[PDB]
Amino acid sequence: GAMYDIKKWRHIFKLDPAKHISDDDLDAICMSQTDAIMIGGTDDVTEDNVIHLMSKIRRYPLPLVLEISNIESVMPGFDFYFVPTVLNSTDVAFHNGTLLEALKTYGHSIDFEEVIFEGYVVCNADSKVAKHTKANTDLTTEDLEAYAQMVNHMYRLPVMYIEYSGIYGDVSKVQAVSEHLTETQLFYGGGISSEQQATEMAAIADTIIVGDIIYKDIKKALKTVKI
Amino acid sequence: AMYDIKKWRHIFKLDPAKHISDDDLDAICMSQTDAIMIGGTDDVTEDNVIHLMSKIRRYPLPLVLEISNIESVMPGFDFYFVPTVLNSTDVAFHNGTLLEALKTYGHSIDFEEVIFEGYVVCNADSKVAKHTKANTDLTTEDLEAYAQMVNHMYRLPVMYIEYSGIYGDVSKVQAVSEHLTETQLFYGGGISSEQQATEMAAIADTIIVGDIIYKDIKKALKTVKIK
């Protein structure tokens, strides 16, 4: 089952369950070389369409993961749950606050082997996720490096997630951050929309996460896997 | 074997602001304690720590520093215990301050000797609770969730139940232990009798004794006789 060893993942397609994906486009990505399909949507996951989406996704043989945002999103059935802790958020709620309530609720029966805690760092000052988590987006390269160090040596977390929220972020900073991660895997997301960019980043980061372009140019999207 | 925290059962904890006689100091360092921890939940008086270290280093037992604030950071200790107050309402006590420290000292820290502690402040009327704006209304469920969170999500080496000066709720500590497996349970707060040291050192992995050292050196040395 090399299929389910996140450490080997290089590319993940991230679906916003709130947007419409056609069955042919869905088939396209699920058939691709991508390592996993991730359902996200940083807010009020609408149980209804998430289940619609996973029903379709389970017809293919590839890891289906959920990016839990809020206690509302928690649903059984996924292969992995990626739980973020927004390191640069100024509200304890996105640190461990929400997670404490989820655990209060489902603690009794979670299989922590399938849960993955991610050091999440919001880097796009003008994003829904930056404004919701009251994230302190004024980050210098030193700040990111301190964060990387904090993730890599102090919490020693399996994943550090650089989230540029839709726009292609600062390659140099991502590059600075990768420098300090060693034991921790580096996930990058934000703006990839060209085999060129996917290759640039997948070079620095360990796993790249392509999302928006799926709903804009399925053909370009499929290009991001060629990294 | 001396420096493997996982075998430690008792730790004597010295407030560097309080005075301790050369003879009481001698007594604790000669005891069966596994280590001396210099704490003081506030502004370490760079002055008396060096004095205390000076006397303590004549004995061969581990000397550890519990860093509270970025001020405390100094060389010469066997291990540095860094807290993250999980039930604090202020990001500064989650990782805020830590991020600063890392910006400054990041370049020269031997992370091998740094130990990240999952801290849960449990005494509503404590300087530490008021300082870190800790949310001290914790049910057993809450504590269990916290345990789970430390043990499985953060997967930190130590979860520290801090009852700040008073002997806490044995049942709750017992509940918390239930969930820690890979994580070492440190307990502190009120042990002042061979009886209490013994009760707790049965539930927790390591009991931390402090206040009684300055009140009844004879009773204090009774706390290391934990069966």
- CA quadruple A95, A101, A107, A110: dihedral sign: negative
- Give the nearest partner residue to A103 out of B111, B116, B145, using CB atoms: B145
CB atoms under 10 Å from CB of A78, counted, come to 20
**Best CA proximity match to B85, nearest among B57, B117, B51, B55:** B117
d(CA B137, CA A112): 26
- Give the nearest partner residue to A95 out of B91, B111, B142, using CB atoms: B91
Partners of residue A135 on adjacent β-strands: A89
d(CA A37, CA A152): 25
A87: which 2 tokens? 């390191």
Rounded to a whole number of angstroms, the distance from the CA of A192 to the nearest CA of chain B is 29
CB burial string A150-161: b at 16+ within 10 A, e below: bbbbbbbbbbbb
Query: Helix or strand or coil: residue A32?
Result: coil
Query: Helix or strand or coil: residue A69?
Result: coil
- Measured in Å, how far apart are chain A's first and last C-alpha atoms? 22
Asked if B82 contacts B102 with a C-beta cutoff of 8 angstroms, the reply is no
Among the residues of chain B, which ranges form H helices? 22-30, 46-56, 96-105, 127-131, 140-148, 170-179, 194-203, 217-220
Inter-chain CB proximity A154 and B94 less than 8 Å: no
Query: Helix or strand or coil: residue A99?
Result: helix
Question: E strand or H helix at A119, and its extent?
Answer: strand A115-122
Rounded to a whole number of angstroms, the distance from the CA of B107 to the nearest CA of chain A is 10
Partners of residue A82 on adjacent β-strands: A67, A116
A170: which 2 tokens? 């600062």
d(CA A78, CA A54): 8
**Best CA proximity match to A168, nearest among A216, A200, A214:** A200
**Does the CB of A149 have a partner CB in chain B at under 8 Å?**
yes
DSSP state of A89: B
CB atoms under 10 Å from CB of A31, counted, come to 11
Concatenating the DSSP letter of every residue in B11-74 gives EEEE-TTS---HHHHHHHHHSS-SEEEE--SS---HHHHHHHHHHHTTS-S-EEEE--STTT--
Question: E strand or H helix at A129, and its extent?
Answer: helix A128-132
Question: Is position A39 annotated in a ligand binding site?
Answer: no
Distances (CA, A) of A211 to A38, A192, B26, B178, B192: 9, 8, 64, 41, 59
Instruction: For domain A1-227, give the fold.
Output: TIM Barrel (3.20.20)
Inter-chain CB proximity A103 and B148 less than 8 Å: yes
d(CA B50, CA B39): 13
Q: How many residues does chain B have?
A: 227
**Does the CB of B150 have a partner CB in chain A at under 8 Å?**
no
Question: E strand or H helix at A142, and its extent?
Answer: helix A141-149
Query: How would you classify the pairing of strands A207-210 and A11-15?
Result: parallel
d(CA A110, CA A58): 21
CB atoms under 10 Å from CB of A135, counted, come to 26
Residue A101: burial class (beta carbons within 10 Å; 0-12, 13-18, 19+)? middle
Query: Helix or strand or coil: residue A11?
Result: strand
Asked if B207 contacts B201 with a C-beta cutoff of 8 angstroms, the reply is yes
- Long-range pairs for A26-30: beta carbons < 8 A, 24 or more residues apart: A26/A53, A26/A56, A26/A57, A27/A60, A28/A218, A28/A221, A28/A222, A29/A214, A29/A218, A29/A221, A29/A222, A30/A57, A30/A59, A30/A60, A30/A62
Compute and round to an integer the Cα radius of gyration of chain A: 16
Compute and round to an integer the Cα radius of gyration of chain B: 16
Annotated binding site of B: 13, 15, 41, 160-165, 190, 210-211
d(CA A85, CA B155): 14
**Does the CB of A90 have a partner CB in chain B at under 8 Å?**
yes
What Å resolution does this PDB entry report? 3.0
Asked if A5 contacts A35 with a C-beta cutoff of 8 angstroms, the reply is no
What does residue B109 show for φ and ψ, rounded to 5 degrees?
-105, 135
Inter-chain CB proximity B145 and A96 less than 8 Å: no
Hey, what's the torsion of the CAs at B15, B168, B32, B17, to 10 degrees? 0
Query: Helix or strand or coil: residue B110?
Result: coil
